[PDB]
């Protein structure tokens with residue numbers, strides 16, 4: 001061959017991409033996350049022969065967040081059912097992410113609507129989580145390991161960003177610094193690393209026609225201990241019953257739940 005190739009030719013302007021102000025055309029609009037942490041979100045609906053869309057707009061540091069979800073959406077969709085990216089734009093202070101909506105209701109909503117199906121619903125969740133954790137880690141370009149997350153948590157703590165009102169019952173009213181200190185007493189342990197979602201909660205898994213058809217909110221996707229996802233989902237199931245909590249582990253394939261790793265990941269999520 002031949003190296004250090006830097007060969008220039010004259011060219012006319014290429015054909016540029018169709019703009020954002022085009023995909024979104026005939027739609028209704030609604031802000032769905034008023035007062036929350038993160039982007040402005042627009043629900044676009046009501047176009048004949050066109051699917052429902054969401055458009056996230058992040059400004060400043062939140063633009064980095066939206067950019068983070070976009071690349072993770074792009075990567076993970078080869079393995080899992082996710083919203084498809086219709087259009088994404090990054091400028092120096094803004095990011096815009098246009099995605100298709102996944103029809104259906106959240107796992108939380110389905111559990112509430114179908115309480116007599118709790119056990120079948122948890123079975124579906126475990127199968128879906130097993131599918132995610134079966135993606136070979138060698139395929140994943142994203143790091144979500146505990147060293148990375150612990151540094152993010154330290155930062156949020158030092159910047160006053162930890163929501164101390166939202167701690168689990170067993171840490172109710174604890175100072176953030178106490179959670180930090182006690183959490184470190186669970187370390188170290190050997191990670192059992194898999195492709196994790198990062199916020200595998202009942203709000204982020206979508207059911208339609210009785211089947212688990214997708215997951216959303218993938219900005220924290222990356223390689224981490226499997227308990228990162230087990231802990232968050234186990235926690236949510238506590239709003240329903242301890243039997244369903246137990247069932248999650250059993251159906252996922254863990255007979256002997258590692259209480260230390262469970263506790264560690266529950267505590268880590270307090271900071272986020």
Ligand SMILES: NC[C@H]1O[C@H](O[C@H]2[C@H](O)[C@@H](O[C@H]3O[C@H](CO)[C@@H](O)[C@H](N)[C@H]3O)[C@H](N)C[C@@H]2N)[C@H](O)[C@@H](O)[C@@H]1O
Pocket residue numbers: 037163166167168169199201235236237238239269270271272
């Ligand atoms: N700050 C932003 C984050 O806020 C929530 O995450 C928080 C959980 O809600 C808390 O737990 C409470 O809610 C659970 C159900 O969600 C219940 O099972 C549990 N008993 C409750 O104590 C947990 N302590 C901390 C975690 N950061 C959202 O889910 C997450 O998407 C969002 O990014």
Ligand SMILES: CC(C)(C)n1nc(Cc2cccc3ccccc23)c2c(N)ncnc21
Pocket residue numbers: 032041043054083100101102103104105106206216217
């Ligand atoms: C953009 C993001 C917040 C990540 N998102 N959220 C959902 C859930 C959801 C389902 C049905 C109606 C809703 C109305 C307001 C907010 C969310 C709704 C959702 C989804 N189904 N499909 C794709 N993205 C979704």
Ligand SMILES: [Cl-]
Pocket residue numbers: 242243246
């Ligand atoms: Cl029980």
Ligand code: NA
Pocket residue numbers: 076077078079080081082
């Ligand atoms: Na997909």
Ligand code: NA
Pocket residue numbers: 168169234235236238
């Ligand atoms: Na709990």
